[PDB]
Design a protein around this ligand. Structure first.
Ligand code: HEM
Ligand code: HEM
Ligand SMILES: O=C(CCCCCn1ccnc1)N[C@@H](Cc1ccccc1)C(=O)O
Ligand SMILES: O=C(CCCCCn1ccnc1)N[C@@H](Cc1ccccc1)C(=O)O
Lengths: 445, 447
């Protein structure tokens, strides 16, 4: 066997105070840098093991040996997302049922149907930036969140959040950050039930109000249509009212936060790497020859897609997923695991494995993705694994390629503050305070 | 726009322009005169030769264009069948063999090949260490010895033992005379004339001799290329390759796995001895990195400047000089040249690599520093390994072998261009510098 490294401990609290930080993922990456491809992490009543090497993670992604686990973060999310797709166990009846019902909503016939509504929101973004005065700047993650929230609202539910008509974020968004802030605070409390609880219940209510409005309002053929009318071929059943509500909550959050982070990181890397920005902008100008992009044109933005994958390599905006051992098994030939033992896949560290990518892992080089065939299996996992992989991957990448393509077509960008990367962590990653200036190329829509 | 076209010969159209020993260089001269695109007609065929990055970047759009079998590849297909290089993308055996063989070029596999590449590379170094004073090196001959032995050993655990022979193996000589016959046949108006019965008989003998080698390799039969051919299963269909296609893959990899790589090493050494400042910089890297008696896999990955030398040699003289494409549907090229579904294109790689709007005015100068940063190179400007899903499956194999061998050469010898060699590019289906010779003075560093 092989004894597993473990970071510094705090008495009876074990490793738990290491998570008492604003940037826990980045703290865990630093621990992985020090301890290597695997380390144990203990809290009162919990043990897990953080994996960082492709060698171990490829075994963890073997679905015959490991299944998706609900991390403590996902168990928190489950308090309001229920048995929606992202917070259900694979063995719960409603996972496979909703999976079968909703997977056609992300087929290529479906993406072609969403395209016009994605363009609707993208044009609003371009128009906002065209209308800024001289020396005004862009708050990048803020505007990317406006775009991605509006896109999932419109494409999925025919609901307009109208985020570009607001200077502050919507009630939904603000409350959910406070609930998450509270959730993380309660983790470090020895006696949580000591006479805070009320606000979380209030936050669960704001989201239910938007969900009822979306349902009552609903001829359309979008995500909500399939939720309300689709039947699972296996059970022959449609989703029930309770699970539909959970899916709406699930897709409103999962359908925009990570995609906003991706667009924000991609633009960050472009302005920090002018050779790459020039190459991406040349593609956008050459391919996007019409006032609004067509579906087929977006599919031709190969280098823009490479930029997005390389941004996901360095800063995968959903930074981890969790697994449990289905039976007793031995990991890597050296770490015996018992049935039910948990693993965490630390995606940013996997993506920095020098034995896979070479020694220059910290450099932003979209050309790594010029030939998809050259990447080993399970080396690149920003969308999770297997049957529990991200159902919205094609949606996110089509939206982000379209929008980044239009951004590069219509503006020159300046890193006017020489922005120093500052990664704020919710359950996802984004570059806090990232601002740029955009000079219009004066190309009409 | 009306497409330029070179001079014609009546009903023979442009075909007599290819009746030359150096057709690629003839086509480059035509491209120099006519520009980024020209029509080329023969009896029963029309194609268009592209030379600018502006047009070739569109041709590399896989939604609009797919790999075409040129007449040269149709010739190779007479004995390479539906192997990887001569199959159409839509033939079942292309994707099937692609999925089965791609793991044979993963980095776990390359680490497995490294020791066998070192085996052959040491034989090269020892041959040159053992030359007497004032003896010289026949460069393309020894590079072909090395690359043939390397693909034989790494791919099939078969030793050609080329360093034990003063003349090439029979199949190599067999290969070229078959090609010579094929290229003569282009010019024949009546190929089924009885006057060419003798020519056909010899072609079949050649296909037999190469096939005799394949039988020997299979009869002999590790975790190598042939292992995957015989045991791998395509994840999509769940099927292994059948015996007939395996034979075609062996033929394919025996040829594709060594000829272009020998040309690359030969051109790289040519450019180094013609550019002493570059040679000194590469030799300094080799001395700094290769600190052990034999290079490690990791050390080869660290020969950064040597890798740039190889890419710059591929820029000026890409040893696979062209590839062919066809339009998947009606489309317009460059906004001005309308194409119909099925219309064919030829990508003239040496001319693409001389596009002054991409590389600057010094395109003919050998400057490996052009390749310091791949992000600084425009998209589709550099295509020595083809394009897209039909790009060279052996690219990393070729570059690892050539970097290892060139690194060891630079570590162990000083080189002299003692004849002031005048570049003379011999054309098969690939390019190589004929008659290139050097003298090597050992630095007396043991292995
Ligand atoms: C760049 C953007 C995105 C990233 C990086 C991302 C990442 C991920 C990851 C890593 C998982 C697996 C999590 C786990 O195993 O616990 C996942 C699952 C999921 N994602 Fe995404 N996602 C993105 C965009 C989207 C979009 C646009 C949607 C909806 C339109 C979406 C909806 C979902 C859902 C429903 C699941 C759960 C799937 C299931 O278990 O059946 N995501 N995502
Ligand atoms: C410097 C050395 C090399 C060069 C310049 C080169 C060049 C090329 C080019 C341009 C193509 C595409 C041809 C077309 O589109 O018709 C190609 C394909 C191919 N090459 Fe290479 N090659 C080299 C080394 C190798 C090696 C070492 C191997 C085998 C170990 C190999 C095997 C193949 C195969 C099998 C294909 C067909 C791939 C497919 O269509 O699936 N080549 N090569
Ligand atoms: O590491 C992480 C971050 C994972 C969140 C990703 C969420 N996502 C998925 C798709 N889109 C977002 N989380 C651990 C922390 C912990 C470890 C031990 C003990 C207590 C807490 C956990 O939640 O269990
Ligand atoms: O230009 C070429 C040379 C291409 C050879 C590439 C061979 N290779 C590929 C991978 N490794 C080697 N070939 C044309 C010539 C022709 C044009 C018009 C009419 C008749 C013949 C053709 O073969 O079609």
């Amino acid at each position: 066997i092989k004894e597993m490294p473990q970071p510094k401990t705090f008495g009876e609290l074990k490793n738990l105070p290491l998570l008492n930080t604003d940037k826990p993922v980045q703290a865990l990456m630093k621990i992985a840098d020090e301890l290597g491809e695997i380390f144990k992490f203990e809290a009162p009543g919990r043990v897990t093991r953080y994996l960082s090497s492709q060698r171990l993670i490829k075994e963890a992604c073997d679905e015959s040996r490991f299944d998706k686990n609900l991390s403590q973060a996902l168990k928190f999310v489950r308090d309001f997302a229920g048995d929606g797709l992202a917070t259900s166990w694979t063995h719960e009846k409603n996972w496979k049922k909703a999976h079968n019902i909703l997977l056609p909503s992300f087929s290529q016939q479906a993406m072609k149907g969403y395209h016009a509504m994605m363009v609707d929101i993208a044009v609003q973004l371009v128009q906002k930036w065209e209308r800024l005065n001289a020396d005004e700047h862009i708050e990048v993650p803020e505007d990317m969140t406006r775009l991605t929230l509006d896109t999932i609202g419109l494409c999925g539910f025919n609901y307009r959040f109208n985020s570009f008509y607001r200077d502050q974020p919507h009630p939904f968004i603000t409350s959910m950050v406070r609930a998450l802030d509270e959730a993380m605070n309660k983790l470090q409390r020895a006696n949580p039930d000591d006479p805070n609880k009320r606000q979380f219940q209030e936050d669960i209510k704001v989201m239910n109000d938007l969900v009822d409005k979306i349902i009552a309002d609903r001829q359309s053929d979008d995500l909500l249509t399939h939720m309300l009318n689709g039947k699972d071929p296996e059970t022959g059943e449609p989703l029930d009212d309770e699970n539909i509500r959970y899916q709406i909550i699930t897709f409103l959050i999962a359908g925009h936060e990570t995609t906003s982070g991706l667009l924000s990181f991609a633009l960050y890397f472009l302005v920090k790497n002018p050779h790459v920005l020039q190459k991406a902008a040349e593609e956008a100008a050459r391919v996007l020859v019409d006032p609004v992009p067509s579906y087929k044109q977006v599919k031709q933005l190969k280098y823009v897609g490479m930029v997005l994958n390389e941004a996901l390599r360095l800063w995968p905006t959903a930074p981890a997923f969790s697994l449990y051992a289905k039976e007793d098994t031995v990991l890597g030939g050296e770490y015996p695991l018992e049935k039910g033992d948990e693993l965490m896949v630390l995606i940013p560290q996997l993506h920095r494995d020098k034995t896979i990518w070479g020694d220059d892992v910290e450099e932003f080089r979209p050309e790594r993705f010029e030939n998809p065939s050259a990447i080993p299996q399970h080396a690149f996992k920003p969308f999770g694994n297997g049957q529990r992989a991200c159902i919205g991957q094609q949606f996110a990448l089509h939206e982000a390629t379209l929008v980044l393509g239009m951004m590069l077509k219509h503006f020159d960008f300046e890193d006017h503050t020489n922005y120093e990367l500052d990664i704020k962590e919710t359950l996802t990653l984004k570059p806090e305070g990232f601002v740029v200036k955009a000079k219009s190329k004066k190309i009409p829509l």
